[PDB]
Amino acid sequence: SSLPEKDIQYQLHPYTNARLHQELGPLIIERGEGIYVYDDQGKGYIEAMAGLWSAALGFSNQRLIKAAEQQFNTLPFYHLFSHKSHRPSIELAEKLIEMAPVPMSKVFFTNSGSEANDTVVKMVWYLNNALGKPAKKKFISRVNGYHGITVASASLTGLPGNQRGFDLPLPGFLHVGCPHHYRFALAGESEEHFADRLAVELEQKILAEGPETIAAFIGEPLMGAGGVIVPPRTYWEKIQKVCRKYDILVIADEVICGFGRTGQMFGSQTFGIQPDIMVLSKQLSSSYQPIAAILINAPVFEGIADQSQALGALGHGFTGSGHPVATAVALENLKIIEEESLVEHAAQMGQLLRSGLQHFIDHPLVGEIRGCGLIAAVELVGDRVSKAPYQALGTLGRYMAGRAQEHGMITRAMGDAVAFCPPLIVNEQEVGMIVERFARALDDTTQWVGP
């Protein structure tokens, strides 16, 4: 009958406890503008996550809306199968290739990040069969990495919450350590030496598995959903040397880091990664349309092209691959990010965010503050010396996130860390408000944990 009642009756929600949902119902979000969303009671919230790490231009960018309209009225749907094409897919693909931080050869479009990583898995398998290396198939990823939730991409993902009860990972999807100094460094170990030990771990993993069986290493430049985990200094340098030593492809999952999130246009620039393949989504279209993109370099394309010829055609593609409305919106989105100098602006807003949060560095429940550019997290602990949680891992984060919402801010808990990933258009005072609302939530949480 009521709208909340209909939701409970008819929707199975993602990333939601279904039974609790039947009791509590939804928080229905009705409208958005700038960095704000409003619920159906008219309460406004700063969307400090940009939705799902994604709405770079906020929730009422008229240029994107008009670009959708203009394309809708020209050609509202067509496809790229069997030599068919259309201008928006062509022009977007050109723009993505030309702005890539390393030389890239081709773009392949999907709807989601998960589909894109799933497609990259198939591409690498197809590639290595093309080349006559049928054993070179295994993927290496990392504990706490997030790469999506198809059967294959959830296998790449290294978060237990995405695997438990789903019979994952599949075989051939291997995991090395999470590069988080605060949690996994040895006592008195430096960042650089933590990085050394991670590179050794990767090489030993490869040697134990048989280097000839390892096709690819995939990683987010910095880990998003897994906690805003910034890798230790020299990690990417040392990891890439191990990969290049055994002819292992380096895949940068830029689904969150892409398009100005980390202080430069790509996480690959910020962290000195020269990937063979890049995966892009989210900020690509400010999530105004579902779209993702895979960039592959020359060797990857040439092997695939050779096979697609021998086997008649590339037996892969989604109905929505390169959708003309989604590609048109993404094209306009990238033009706005360039014309408005949002990469530079976000970097400056990020410095303000990070300096604001650092006033709480000696709070008794603050275990670590981390991030770079305009992405950050504050990890809470029940005890700073031991780094132990209050009650059980997740208890603090759950409480903090709930308090932040009460104070008009949407953040996301990742265990006991709360994340910040605001729209790139956030202004200085809005950053101040984000920090103030974080502060109030923290104060509430501290009184709740109590003496």
145-204 binders of ligand PLP (CB under 6 A): 146-148
Cα 436 to Cα 286, 382, 406, 443, distances in angstroms = 26, 22, 13, 10
For the beta carbon of residue 366, count every other beta carbon within 10 angstroms: 18
- In this chain, which of 114, 162, 262, 286 binds ligand PLP, going by CB under 6 A? 114
Tell me the closest approach of the beta carbon of residue 340 to a second copy, in angstroms.
18
Q: Of 415, 400, 341, 412, nearest to 376 (Cα)? A: 412
286 φψ region: left (φ > 0), alpha (ψ -120 to 50), beta (else): left
Pairing type for strands 138-142 and 173-176 reads parallel
Enter the DSSP assignment of 209. Answer: H
**Exposure string (b/e) for 305-320, b if CB count within 10 Å is 16 or more?**
eebeeeeeeeeebbeb
Residue nearest to ligand PLP (CB): 113
Query: Which of the ranges 69-77, 144-152, 240-248, 431-439 carries the binding residues for ligand PLP, by CB under 6 A?
Result: 144-152
Bridge partner list, 409 = 46
Tell me the closest approach of the beta carbon of residue 63 to a second copy, in angstroms.
11
Q: Residue 226 or 356: which CB sits closer to a second copy?
A: 226
Residue 147 binding result from a second copy, ligand PLP, none, given CB thresholds of 5 to 8 Å by partner type: ligand PLP
Q: Does 118 bind ligand PLP (CB under 6 A)?
A: no
Q: Residue 309 or 358: which CB sits closer to a second copy?
A: 309
CA dist., res. 411 & res. 144, Å (int): 19
Residue 167 binding result from a second copy, ligand PLP, none, given CB thresholds of 5 to 8 Å by partner type: a second copy
For the beta carbon of residue 410, count every other beta carbon within 10 angstroms: 19
Enter the DSSP assignment of 315. Answer: -
CA dist., res. 258 & res. 296, Å (int): 15
Tell me the closest approach of the beta carbon of residue 219 to ligand PLP, in angstroms.
9
Q: Residue 133 or 363: which CB sits closer to a second copy?
A: 133
| Contacting ligand PLP within 215-234 (CB under 6 A) | 220, 224-225
Enter the DSSP assignment of 446. Answer: H
- In this chain, which of 126, 236, 271, 318 binds ligand PLP, going by CB under 6 A? 318
Query: Which of the ranges 228-236, 252-260, 346-354, 436-444 carries the binding residues for ligand PLP, by CB under 6 A?
Result: 252-260
Residue 166 binding result from ligand PLP, a second copy, none, given CB thresholds of 5 to 8 Å by partner type: a second copy
Tell me the closest approach of the beta carbon of residue 120 to ligand PLP, in angstroms.
11
Contact in structure between 410 and 42 (CB atoms under 8 Å): no
Residue 361 binding result from ligand PLP, a second copy, none, given CB thresholds of 5 to 8 Å by partner type: none
Q: Does 113 bind ligand PLP (CB under 6 A)?
A: yes
Tell me the closest approach of the beta carbon of residue 399 to ligand PLP, in angstroms.
24
Tell me the closest approach of the beta carbon of residue 348 to a second copy, in angstroms.
25
Query: Which of the ranges 126-134, 136-144, 299-307, 314-322 carries the binding residues for ligand PLP, by CB under 6 A?
Result: 314-322
- In this chain, which of 93, 255, 294, 295 binds ligand PLP, going by CB under 6 A? 255
Contacts 24+ apart (CB under 8 A), 307-311: 307/126, 307/127, 307/129, 307/130
Bridge partner list, 142 = 176
Q: Residue 228 or 342: which CB sits closer to ligand PLP?
A: 228
Q: Of 146, 240, 230, nearest to 191 (Cα)? A: 230
- Interface contacts to ligand PLP, rule CB under 6 A: 53, 112-114, 117, 146-148, 220, 224-225, 253, 255-256, 281, 318-320
